[PDB]
Design an enzyme around this catalytic site. Structure first.
Site, PDB file in Angstrom:
ATOM      1  N   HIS A  15       0.804  -1.234   0.000  1.00 58.86           N
ATOM      2  CA  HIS A  15       0.000   0.000   0.000  1.00 58.86           C
ATOM      3  C   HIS A  15       0.837   1.285   0.000  1.00 58.86           C
ATOM      4  O   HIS A  15       0.795   2.092   0.932  1.00 58.86           O
ATOM      5  CB  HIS A  15      -1.014  -0.018   1.134  1.00 58.86           C
ATOM      6  N   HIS A  73       1.148   1.623  -5.809  1.00 57.59           N
ATOM      7  CA  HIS A  73      -0.168   0.963  -5.844  1.00 57.59           C
ATOM      8  C   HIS A  73      -1.198   2.017  -6.290  1.00 57.59           C
ATOM      9  O   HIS A  73      -1.928   1.758  -7.243  1.00 57.59           O
ATOM     10  CB  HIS A  73      -0.545   0.407  -4.473  1.00 57.59           C
ATOM     11  N   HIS A 124      -7.210   6.870  -2.694  1.00 63.77           N
ATOM     12  CA  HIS A 124      -7.948   5.789  -2.018  1.00 63.77           C
ATOM     13  C   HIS A 124      -7.202   5.032  -0.904  1.00 63.77           C
ATOM     14  O   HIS A 124      -7.875   4.383  -0.111  1.00 63.77           O
ATOM     15  CB  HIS A 124      -8.539   4.804  -3.027  1.00 63.77           C
ATOM     16  N   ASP A 125      -5.855   5.073  -0.845  1.00 60.34           N
ATOM     17  CA  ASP A 125      -5.129   4.374   0.234  1.00 60.34           C
ATOM     18  C   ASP A 125      -4.160   5.322   0.950  1.00 60.34           C
ATOM     19  O   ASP A 125      -3.186   4.875   1.551  1.00 60.34           O
ATOM     20  CB  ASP A 125      -4.401   3.112  -0.316  1.00 60.34           C
ATOM     21  N   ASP A 129      -8.782  -1.192  -8.061  1.00 62.93           N
ATOM     22  CA  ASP A 129      -8.047  -1.619  -6.867  1.00 62.93           C
ATOM     23  C   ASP A 129      -7.402  -3.020  -6.981  1.00 62.93           C
ATOM     24  O   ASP A 129      -6.306  -3.224  -6.447  1.00 62.93           O
ATOM     25  CB  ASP A 129      -8.951  -1.523  -5.628  1.00 62.93           C
TER      26      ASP A 129
HETATM   27  C1  7XS Z   1     -12.992 -10.223   2.979  1.00 59.35           C
HETATM   28  O1  7XS Z   1     -12.519 -11.446   2.413  1.00 59.35           O
HETATM   29  C2  7XS Z   1     -11.235 -11.495   1.928  1.00 59.35           C
HETATM   30  C3  7XS Z   1     -10.323 -10.446   1.913  1.00 59.35           C
HETATM   31  C4  7XS Z   1      -9.082 -10.621   1.328  1.00 59.35           C
HETATM   32  C5  7XS Z   1      -8.761 -11.833   0.732  1.00 59.35           C
HETATM   33  O2  7XS Z   1      -7.619 -12.087   0.002  1.00 59.35           O
HETATM   34  C6  7XS Z   1      -6.375 -11.357   0.239  1.00 59.35           C
HETATM   35  C7  7XS Z   1      -6.508 -10.005  -0.470  1.00 59.35           C
HETATM   36  N1  7XS Z   1      -5.391 -10.415  -1.333  1.00 59.35           N
HETATM   37  C8  7XS Z   1      -4.922 -10.014  -2.548  1.00 59.35           C
HETATM   38  N2  7XS Z   1      -4.213 -10.989  -3.139  1.00 59.35           N
HETATM   39  C9  7XS Z   1      -3.751 -10.674  -4.352  1.00 59.35           C
HETATM   40  N3  7XS Z   1      -3.923  -9.553  -5.054  1.00 59.35           N
HETATM   41  C10 7XS Z   1      -4.619  -8.615  -4.398  1.00 59.35           C
HETATM   42  C11 7XS Z   1      -5.172  -8.722  -3.111  1.00 59.35           C
HETATM   43  C12 7XS Z   1      -5.729  -7.417  -2.846  1.00 59.35           C
HETATM   44  C13 7XS Z   1      -6.316  -6.903  -1.555  1.00 59.35           C
HETATM   45  C14 7XS Z   1      -5.314  -6.728  -0.407  1.00 59.35           C
HETATM   46  C15 7XS Z   1      -4.273  -5.680  -0.750  1.00 59.35           C
HETATM   47  C16 7XS Z   1      -6.022  -6.343   0.877  1.00 59.35           C
HETATM   48  N4  7XS Z   1      -5.557  -6.634  -3.864  1.00 59.35           N
HETATM   49  N5  7XS Z   1      -4.852  -7.358  -4.829  1.00 59.35           N
HETATM   50  C17 7XS Z   1      -4.395  -6.783  -6.089  1.00 59.35           C
HETATM   51  C18 7XS Z   1      -5.337 -11.789  -0.803  1.00 59.35           C
HETATM   52  C19 7XS Z   1      -9.660 -12.889   0.771  1.00 59.35           C
HETATM   53  C20 7XS Z   1     -10.892 -12.724   1.383  1.00 59.35           C
HETATM   54 MG    MG Z   2      -7.626   0.337   0.748  1.00 58.73          MG
HETATM   55 ZN    ZN Z   3      -5.923  -0.005  -2.816  1.00 58.43          ZN
END
Ligand code: 7XS
Ligand code: MG
Ligand code: ZN
Length: 338
Positions: free
Chosen positions: A78, A82, A118-119, A230
């Protein structure tokens, strides 16, 4: 202040002069050197005609862009790169999907500005951590929910209220209120908990068909587009997906380490001793990312390639999954790790 001088007096480079493939879904904005990103933001704003349409003051816009970049910290994921890559995807949606048939100009403008902001000031920890650690942000926003997203919005407002940074101070009172209200809804939509709550409403909208005369459809579409921006790191090749998983899990495991030190049991995906990265990435792709780009494809046929790339990246995790099992001895021929 020298960055500001050059950003204002040197002139805004045409979008093509950045890279010949800059306006394509195949382009990886993370390839752009960090030192060229503020100029790229101005180039994109200029190409979308926002600077001229809204008569944005150049000294004010230059100060705003640098203040937004300065507002990001340096956790593994973050950070400003990003926000820049998320803003680049918004520009790609504008260039490739004909947004102008679905949204108002001010809405498309609010989406881009929200992507940049946004972040803001992210500390590398999630909403649950703010509450568990009794952080100042939870003291301010825990009763309202989406702690970090309320903070990102408040940081964007603080930048706009800094002398010489209000890019909307000449707007009519009605347009100014509208802009800040859109930024609020869009930034709050970045909480994945909000996305999961509205997912059935998004499915229903795609099913009945987008109604340009329905104000709730405009609100829902902006939420979907923001989420699409995002998670856009997943719409590129395996090289991006692999690198992004390293950044995300380094950030998650750092949080997990802090939770353990506090005497708390971290979530499985935040525990470096329990997290099995291929399984967790397959789960995230299958249940969160793929359904988002499927909805985007249903509403915009030209977005089909995005869903296909996400599906391809999900399949690559299954293909490399066997490599996470230690077969034979490690490279050093020692079992010391036991
Ligand atoms: C509420 O349920 C959930 C929340 C998150 C969850 O998976 C995590 C999020 N993860 C990610 N993995 C790979 N590419 C990602 C993300 C993200 C969000 C993160 C920066 C916060 N953005 N990008 C590009 C793995 C599973 C279930
Ligand atoms: Mg955010
Ligand atoms: Zn973001």
């Amino acid at each position: 202040d020298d960055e500001y001088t050059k950003l204002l007096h040197d002139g805004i480079q045409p979008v093509a002069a950045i890279d010949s493939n800059f306006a394509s879904f195949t382009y990886t904005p993370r390839s752009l050197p960090e030192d060229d990103t503020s100029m790229a933001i101005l180039s994109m704003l200029q190409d979308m005609n926002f600077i001229n349409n809204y008569k944005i003051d150049c000294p004010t816009l230059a100060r705003f862009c640098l203040m937004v970049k300065k507002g990001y910290r340096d956790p593994p994921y973050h950070n400003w790169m990003h926000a820049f890559s998320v803003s680049h995807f918004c520009y790609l949606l504008y260039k490739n999907l004909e947004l102008t048939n679905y949204l108002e100009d001010i809405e498309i403008f609010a989406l881009f500005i929200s992507c940049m902001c946004h972040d803001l000031d992210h500390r590398g920890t999630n909403n649950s951590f703010q509450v568990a650690s009794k952080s100042v942000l939870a003291a301010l926003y825990s009763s309202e929910g989406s702690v970090m997203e309320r903070h990102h919005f408040a940081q964007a407002i603080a930048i706009l209220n800094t002398h010489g940074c209000n890019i909307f101070d000449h707007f009519s009172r009605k347009d100014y209120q509208r802009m800040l209200d859109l930024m609020r809804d869009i930034i709050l939509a970045t909480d994945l908990a909000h996305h999961l709550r509205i997912f059935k409403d998004l499915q229903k909208m795609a099913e009945v068909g987008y109604d340009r005369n329905n104000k709730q459809h405009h609100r829902l579409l902006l939420c979907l587009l923001m989420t699409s921006c995002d998670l856009s790191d997943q719409t590129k090749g395996w090289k991006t997906t692999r690198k992004i998983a390293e950044l995300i899990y380094k950030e998650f495991f750092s949080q997990g380490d802090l939770e353990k030190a506090m005497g708390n049991r971290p979530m499985e995906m935040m525990d470096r001793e329990k997290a099995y990265i291929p399984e967790l990435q397959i789960s995230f792709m299958e249940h969160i990312a793929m359904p988002i780009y499927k909805l985007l494809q249903d509403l915009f046929p030209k977005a089909a390639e995005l869903y296909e790339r996400v599906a391809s990246n999900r399949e690559h995790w299954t293909k490399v999954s066997h490599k996470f099992t230690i077969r034979g001895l490690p490279s050093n021929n020692s079992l010391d790790f036991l």
